[PDB]
Amino acid sequence: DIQMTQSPSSLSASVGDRVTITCRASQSVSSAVAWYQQKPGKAPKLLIYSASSLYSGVPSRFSGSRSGTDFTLTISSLQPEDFATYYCQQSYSFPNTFGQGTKVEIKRTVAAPSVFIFPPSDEQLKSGTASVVCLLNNFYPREAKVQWKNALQSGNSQESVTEQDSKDSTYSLSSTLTLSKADYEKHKVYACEVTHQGLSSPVTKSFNRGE
Amino acid sequence: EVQLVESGGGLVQPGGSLRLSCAASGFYISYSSIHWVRQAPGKGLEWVASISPYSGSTYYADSVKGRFTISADTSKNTAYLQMNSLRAEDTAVYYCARQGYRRRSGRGFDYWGQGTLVTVSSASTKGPSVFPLAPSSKSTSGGTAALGCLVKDYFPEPVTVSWNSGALTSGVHTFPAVLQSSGLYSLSSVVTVPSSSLGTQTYICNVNHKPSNTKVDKKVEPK
RNA sequence: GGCGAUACCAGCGAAACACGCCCUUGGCAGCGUC
């Protein structure tokens, strides 16, 4: 089958930047290549077809080109409605094949995270398990280190990050430490340590078991 | 206008079978090619199968050939995807797509559906336990406070978490679900509120887990 | 140039295959016949 190698896999660009996404076919596909735009949680939408023909209703900022087995999708200048993932797809032979996709995110100034620590819930300690949650509200960039507060724990923590907010272009992160409630009541002060670029020094939020 | 409505998704064991449907409105599928494309959670689009008009010829991807069957019923204006010998690899949202008319859009897929969620796993359905994330800042600090809810150990996806019955959307953050080592999902939903609203504003997280018919509302106020 | 076939790749018929159309062309094809 025809493989579709797409590059880059992700980028961060600012409004007004000219970007060209490259999709290269493993063999001749003529010009039967389309491009799709997919925004988180939504269905894909057709942008251009036949390598270089724009679909109805799509702005003129989108363009496509072919150079043999090479296919580039070009947005002349980024705009505050184009944050999404972009895919190339060949329709020259079956099986049709999509590219791996390109995640387009928005560049913006550095934002420091607001950190909150949440002790395990009195309803939850009744169940015999403990869970401390550290929150890193609205920051930029996604790159953040969360370490659990006093031997530093390893292997018993999970992280989750939201998508880029469509308004302030920020990110949020959560980290959950488990162990057990029996272990939870043998230690005293609990603290999550976070390092971020917009932070001059690591910030540690903590609580005392006993309010 | 033109609509594609996929149905039939759900939870099955490995080796099980599922039959997906795609109801079309605003056009007749007998004059177009219908494609199925799936997307695993957090990954890219993957072409699955397609059927051609007039001839009814079918085509498949190497990962589904022999196990899947695409077909159509023009009297019902509905395409179908029979799924057999399912593996965990087939866990994805399955989209239905119409190939546009050759003159106007070439061979591009000009219309898609909302998709249906197919989960292939041996894990049994389980409802989540819900615990509060008590607010940090007090009621008269003069700044911002962060509160939320922790719903934990549920399978399969998805859940939906709202606040104040959809009335509170500014500043809310429902984090994507992570897979614990126990095999069950868990996520958190938070929100930043002004400290001047604590004690006068009521905050309730409404968590909905349809796969297990579980409905919980948990109250969040200063501990 | 004149007369008759031949539908390979494109294009076209709501149409990637099948079906149908278009005959020096849509390509600065090629076989018969004056």
Numbering used by the authors:
A (entry chain A): 2 to 150, 153 to 214
B (entry chain B): 4 to 226
Please quote the paper that reports this structure.
There have been increased efforts recently to “drug” RNA using orally bioavailable, low-molecular-weight compounds. That structure revealed how multiple interdependent components of the RNA form a well-defined ligand binding pocket that enables theophylline to bind with submicromolar affinity while excluding closely related compounds such as caffeine (which differs by a single methyl group) by more than 10,000-fold. Previous biophysical and modeling studies have shown that the aptamer undergoes a large conformational rearrangement upon binding theophylline.
The apo-crystal was soaked with the aptamer ligand TAL2, and the structure of the complex was solved at 2.46 Å resolution. The electron density for the RNA remained lower than that for the Fab but was sufficient to reveal that a large conformational change had occurred upon ligand binding, forming the binding pocket. However, the ligand could not be precisely placed.
